[PDB]
Amino acid sequence: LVHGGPCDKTSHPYQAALYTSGHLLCGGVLIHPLWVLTAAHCKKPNLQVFLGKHESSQEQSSVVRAVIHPDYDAASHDQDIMLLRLARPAKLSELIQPLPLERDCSAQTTSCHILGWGKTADGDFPDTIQCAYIHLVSREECEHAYPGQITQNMLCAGDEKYGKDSCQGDSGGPLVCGDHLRGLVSWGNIPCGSKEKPGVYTNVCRYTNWIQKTIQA
Ligand SMILES: CC[C@H](NC(=O)[C@H]1CN(c2ccc(C(=N)N)nc2)C(=O)O1)c1cccc2ccccc12
């Protein structure tokens, strides 16, 4: 993410890092000892999930099953969500904790934050997790930002002052509002930066029932 700074070691216990063949690929959110949520465009073979990373608190697991939303549309990023079934149950340890979903699509909090190990503004990739406060942007204003591209399955969020924004390598990471999972990093402007066009996030509240069915099955 661009224009933020390093999170506190204790302020991000739900954050996952997703690797493929030894390369950082995406972020992700622990939402249940056995399940990580991320973006559907993060589907790759040979996935490795690292939890409790920012190391002693860290833990690593293979993926047993990667369930892409049935209706994911790659060209438009509509329905950009994936569930990952961990081989090894997560060891909850205060540096590793699930995050509750936002279940109400009309929740009023518009002050949020984002997190990831994706690209910083200098085009580099950081060893330490980055954080930024941003705000939700109204659907109408986001539709104007990107005509023909914002569905009910997405939410927009950004920062008019400094342009704080997610970026490549942040995909699947959490948009957190009122300490609930509101969104997943999905797509946005390139070069990354939100002073003109907001970041676009998968609208997590619309997937409560699909998440519930997949886990509980
Ligand atoms: C799964 C591959 C990975 N895909 C992405 O990161 C997606 C997310 N995204 C993007 C763009 C802008 C914003 C925003 N402005 N809010 N948010 C997300 C893209 O443009 O592509 C990837 C793409 C390109 C370089 C990478 C380098 C290292 C690791 C992963 C990389």
CATH number at residue 157: 2.40.10.10
CA angle at residue 54 from 48 to 58, to 5 degrees? 55
Same domain for 198 and 107, yes or no, is: yes
Give me ligand 1 centre to Cα 171, in Å.
6
Residues 184 and 34 sit within 8 Å (Cβ to Cβ)? no
**Experimentally determined by:** X-ray
Q: How many domains does the chain have?
A: 2
Q: Which residues contact 140 (CB under 8 A, 6 or more apart)?
A: none
Residues 102 and 95 sit within 8 Å (Cβ to Cβ)? no
Same domain for 212 and 187, yes or no, is: no
Same domain for 27 and 113, yes or no, is: no
Task: Identify the CA nearest to 203 among candidates 79, 110, 112.
Answer: 79
Task: Identify the CA nearest to 27 among candidates 184, 182, 132, 140.
Answer: 184
Measured distance CA(37)–CA(32) in Å, rounded: 9
Same domain for 47 and 128, yes or no, is: no
At residue 112, φ and ψ (nearest 5 deg) are: -130, 180
Same domain for 80 and 106, yes or no, is: no
- The data reach a resolution, in angstroms, of 1.9
Same domain for 69 and 22, yes or no, is: yes
Tokens of 187: 């797509």
Same domain for 89 and 119, yes or no, is: no
Same domain for 94 and 190, yes or no, is: no
Same domain for 94 and 66, yes or no, is: yes
Residues 195 and 160 sit within 8 Å (Cβ to Cβ)? yes
Same domain for 126 and 195, yes or no, is: yes
Q: Please write down the HEC assignment for all residues of the chain.
A: CECCEECCCCCCCCEEEEEECCEEEEEEEEEECCEEEECHHHCCCCEEEEECCCCCCCEEEEEEEEEECCCCECCCCECCCEEEEECCCCCCCCCCCCCCECCCCCCCCCEEEEEECCCCCCCCCCCCCEEEEEEEECHHHHHHHCCCCCCCCEEEEECCCCCCECCCCCCCCEEEECCEEEEEEEECCCCCCCCCCCEEEEEHHHHHHHHHHHHHC
Pocket, ligand 1, Cβ cutoff 6 A: 24-26, 41-42, 165-169, 171, 185, 187-190, 192, 199
Same domain for 32 and 120, yes or no, is: no
Domain of residue 39: give its range. Answer: 16-98+207-216
Same domain for 211 and 188, yes or no, is: no
- For ligand 1, atom 2, the nearest C-alpha belongs to 25
At residue 205, φ and ψ (nearest 5 deg) are: -60, -25
